[PDB]
Every structure is written in C-alpha cells, then in structure tokens.
Design an enzyme around this catalytic site. Structure first.
Site, PDB file in Angstrom:
ATOM      1  N   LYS A  24       0.942  -1.040   0.105  1.00 30.97           N
ATOM      2  CA  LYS A  24      -0.052   0.048   0.235  1.00 30.97           C
ATOM      3  C   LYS A  24       0.864   1.322  -0.022  1.00 30.97           C
ATOM      4  O   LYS A  24       2.311   1.514   0.401  1.00 30.97           O
ATOM      5  CB  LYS A  24      -0.842   0.134   0.817  1.00 30.97           C
ATOM      6  CG  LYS A  24      -0.247   0.117   2.601  1.00 30.97           C
ATOM      7  CD  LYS A  24      -1.538  -0.128   3.753  1.00 30.97           C
ATOM      8  CE  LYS A  24      -2.517   1.240   4.168  1.00 30.97           C
ATOM      9  NZ  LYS A  24      -3.905   1.196   4.540  1.00 30.97           N
ATOM     10  N   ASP A 129       6.507  -4.870 -14.961  1.00 32.64           N
ATOM     11  CA  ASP A 129       5.365  -3.995 -14.271  1.00 32.64           C
ATOM     12  C   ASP A 129       5.184  -2.633 -15.096  1.00 32.64           C
ATOM     13  O   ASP A 129       4.203  -2.382 -14.453  1.00 32.64           O
ATOM     14  CB  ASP A 129       5.414  -4.309 -12.607  1.00 32.64           C
ATOM     15  CG  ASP A 129       3.737  -4.333 -12.011  1.00 32.64           C
ATOM     16  OD1 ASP A 129       3.292  -5.231 -12.685  1.00 32.64           O
ATOM     17  OD2 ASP A 129       3.964  -3.835 -11.025  1.00 32.64           O
TER      18      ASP A 129
HETATM   19  C1  LIG Z   1       2.540   4.060  -8.583  1.00 32.98           C
HETATM   20  O1  LIG Z   1       0.687   3.810  -7.692  1.00 32.98           O
HETATM   21  C2  LIG Z   1       1.311   2.751  -6.630  1.00 32.98           C
HETATM   22  C3  LIG Z   1       1.568   1.489  -6.741  1.00 32.98           C
HETATM   23  C4  LIG Z   1       1.825   1.114  -5.546  1.00 32.98           C
HETATM   24  C5  LIG Z   1       0.653   0.988  -4.712  1.00 32.98           C
HETATM   25 CL1  LIG Z   1       0.464  -0.629  -3.337  1.00 32.98          CL
HETATM   26  C6  LIG Z   1      -0.161   1.606  -4.714  1.00 32.98           C
HETATM   27  C7  LIG Z   1      -0.172   2.961  -6.134  1.00 32.98           C
HETATM   28  C8  LIG Z   1      -0.763   4.108  -6.724  1.00 32.98           C
HETATM   29  N1  LIG Z   1      -2.532   4.062  -6.705  1.00 32.98           N
HETATM   30  N2  LIG Z   1      -3.225   4.854  -7.022  1.00 32.98           N
HETATM   31  C9  LIG Z   1      -4.151   4.825  -7.764  1.00 32.98           C
HETATM   32  C10 LIG Z   1      -2.180   5.670  -6.558  1.00 32.98           C
HETATM   33  C11 LIG Z   1      -0.919   5.329  -6.515  1.00 32.98           C
HETATM   34  N3  LIG Z   1      -0.098   5.769  -5.661  1.00 32.98           N
HETATM   35  C12 LIG Z   1       0.505   7.205  -5.834  1.00 32.98           C
HETATM   36  O2  LIG Z   1      -0.326   7.997  -6.554  1.00 32.98           O
HETATM   37  C13 LIG Z   1       1.761   8.300  -5.597  1.00 32.98           C
HETATM   38  C14 LIG Z   1       2.069   9.411  -5.616  1.00 32.98           C
HETATM   39  N4  LIG Z   1       2.812  10.087  -4.975  1.00 32.98           N
HETATM   40  C15 LIG Z   1       4.460   9.266  -5.468  1.00 32.98           C
HETATM   41  C16 LIG Z   1       4.500   7.682  -5.545  1.00 32.98           C
HETATM   42  C17 LIG Z   1       5.118   6.404  -5.542  1.00 32.98           C
HETATM   43  N5  LIG Z   1       4.449   5.278  -5.432  1.00 32.98           N
HETATM   44  N6  LIG Z   1       3.308   5.698  -5.682  1.00 32.98           N
HETATM   45  C18 LIG Z   1       2.787   7.134  -5.362  1.00 32.98           C
END
Ligand SMILES: COc1ccc(Cl)cc1-c1nn(C)cc1NC(=O)c1cncc2cn[nH]c12
Length: 280
Positions: A24, A129
């Site tokens: 998460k 991925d």
């Molecule tokens: C690449 O994103 C993911 C990867 C793995 C997981 Cl478990 C969830 C997300 C994820 N899902 N969603 C809907 C949005 C995500 N993430 C962000 O908005 C986000 C923003 N700023 C920095 C980072 C670093 N990782 N993720 C970031």
C-alpha cells in the site's frame, strides 16, 4: 543526523493513495515540529514479502533520473519514503484531464517513459510491471516511473531473469516469452511499454483497457485456459487494435514493441528517436 532516516513517531498518515495485493501507498506528512508544517511524502508499506520490499528500497535508493520517482528514505519491518506526486497515476489522471492533454503531450509522456525505462535497463534491471497505473504524473508536462515492486536484476552476459513466483502477474501486459517461460528480458519491458502506450493513447479508458480488448479477441469464457488462449492469439500475429484518433505512424511504433521474437522489437533508444521524429 541522517536525512534519509524517518522516525515513525513523526510520520503522520493523511490518506491512502492506493493498494495492491500486498503493498500500500499512503500520503503522510513528516512532521517533527508537531504543527502540520512538515513535508508531505508518499509512504510504501506492506499490509499486515519484507525481503522483496527491502530489495525494492535498495533498487530505488540507487536510481537517479528525472523520469524516476525520487527516493527520500526509510522508516524502520520497514517503510519506503518517496516524494509525493499529487496528480497520482496516469490511470487516475488521464480520464480526468483529456481537455488538458493532447497527442503532442501524449508523445512527450511516451518519450519520458522510454528515458526512465532506458536508464533502468542501463542499470541491468528488468521492471516486469510497466503499466499506466505505475506511471506517476509530476505535472501536465512530466511523468515518472513510480513503482519498482516486481523489479529484478538481469545478470551480466545473461539476457534475462527467470521468475519463480508469477502469482501477481499483469498477463495482459506480458510478452509471449514471459507468459510461456517466465523469462524477463529488457525487450519484455519494451513489449509492456507498447501496451502502456496503448493505455496512454486511449486516456486509460476502462472499456478499452488491454484486459477488456484482449478478452473481446480471445473470448471471456476460457477460465484457466485464458493465458493459453492469449498466447495462441499472439502466435497468430493478432494484436491490440489502433486506439481511436491515433495516427498510423504512432500505431506503427507501437506494433514494433510487439514483435513476437524479443530480438525483433525496437529498443527504448530506438523508440525515443521514433517519437522525437513525430514531434518535430
Ligand atoms: C505507482 O502507484 C502505486 C504503486 C503501488 C501502490 Cl500499492 C499504489 C500506487 C498508487 N495507486 N494509486 C491509485 C495511486 C498510487 N500512487 C500515488 O499516487 C503516488 C504518488 N506519489 C508518489 C508515489 C510513489 N508510489 N506511489 C505514489
């Protein structure tokens, strides 16, 4: 004091960003002053696989690229601290910003993903991925590869890494060699790029997702034979159709990512030259 060491007691949860099967990502403020003035950080943790997250952390700590999400540090069990990108992923951003994003911007995003991927490749890593859900939006002008959860190091003089655990695999983004033999080459990432390019060109529309489109081609009622039917269709030379309003020259660049044999695919260096030629 180590600026990459984050104390748990000051890491304050704001909201969840997203989640996978085991991991998460949450929006937190690192607030040591206790007055809500601290910087907002993205925090990756495992749901209550520690070995794999520690390897992800070490991979990200040694990547330095404008199109790669910045590593900030760790919170020791362990949590991965990164910069926070409020626009979230392309999957969440593109449907909400079609009026803001045109073909020219889509092709620049495409070039940006190739540079980040080409840098990862040069560091002897295979992503495994590469999908739009893992491409984060810094601004309307810039994207970053945002997750390295399945990333593996390819050995020197060896062209691929063979995966033992395929349980959480995005099969509709996987090249035939990945599907048939769990063999991951840098050309396998190029195949996944083509699929991520199809997503970006359709503004990540759910009804036209790679999964939805392939199931219309192979039939949705094969159950456990689905990956076998997918491989069959790919062997027959069948591919994802041209996104609507996508010019043939962009479609043709996408088709080169999907050459059945790893060796016949266009490399990231090659794709960059391709898109830049279309932008000029
Ligand atoms: C690449 O994103 C993911 C990867 C793995 C997981 Cl478990 C969830 C997300 C994820 N899902 N969603 C809907 C949005 C995500 N993430 C962000 O908005 C986000 C923003 N700023 C920095 C980072 C670093 N990782 N993720 C970031």
């Amino acid at each position: 004091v180590d600026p990459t060491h984050f104390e748990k007691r000051f890491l304050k949860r704001i909201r969840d960003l997203g989640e996978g099967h085991f991991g998460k990502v949450e929006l937190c403020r690192y607030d040591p002053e206790g007055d809500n003035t601290g910087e907002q950080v993205a925090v990756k943790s495992l749901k209550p696989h520690i070995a794999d997250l520690k390897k992800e952390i070490e991979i990200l700590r040694n990547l330095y690229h404008e199109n790669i999400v910045k590593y900030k540090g760790i919170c020791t069990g362990i949590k991965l601290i990164m910069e926070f990108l409020p626009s979230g992923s392309l999957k969440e951003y593109l449907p909400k910003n079609k009026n803001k994003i045109n073909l020219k911007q889509q092709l620049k995003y495409a070039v940006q993903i190739c540079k980040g991927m080409d840098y990862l490749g040069s560091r002897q890593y295979v992503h495994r991925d590469l999908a739009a859900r893992n491409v984060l939006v810094e601004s309307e002008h810039q994207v970053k590869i945002g997750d390295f959860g399945l990333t593996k190091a390819i050995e020197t003089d060896k062209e691929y890494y063979t995966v033992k655990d395929d349980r959480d695999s995005p099969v509709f983004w996987y090249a035939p060699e990945c599907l048939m033999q769990s063999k991951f080459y840098i050309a396998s990432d190029v195949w996944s790029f083509g699929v991520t390019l199809h997503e970006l060109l359709t503004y990540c529309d759910s009804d036209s997702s790679p999964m939805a489109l392939f199931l219309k081609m192979i039939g949705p009622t094969h159950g456990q034979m689905t990956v076998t039917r997918l491989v069959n269709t790919l062997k027959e030379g069948k591919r994802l159709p041209c996104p609507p309003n996508c010019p043939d020259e962009v479609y043709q660049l996408m088709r080169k990512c999907w050459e059945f044999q790893p060796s016949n695919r266009t490399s990231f260096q090659n794709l960059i030259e391709g898109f830049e030629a279309l932008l000029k």
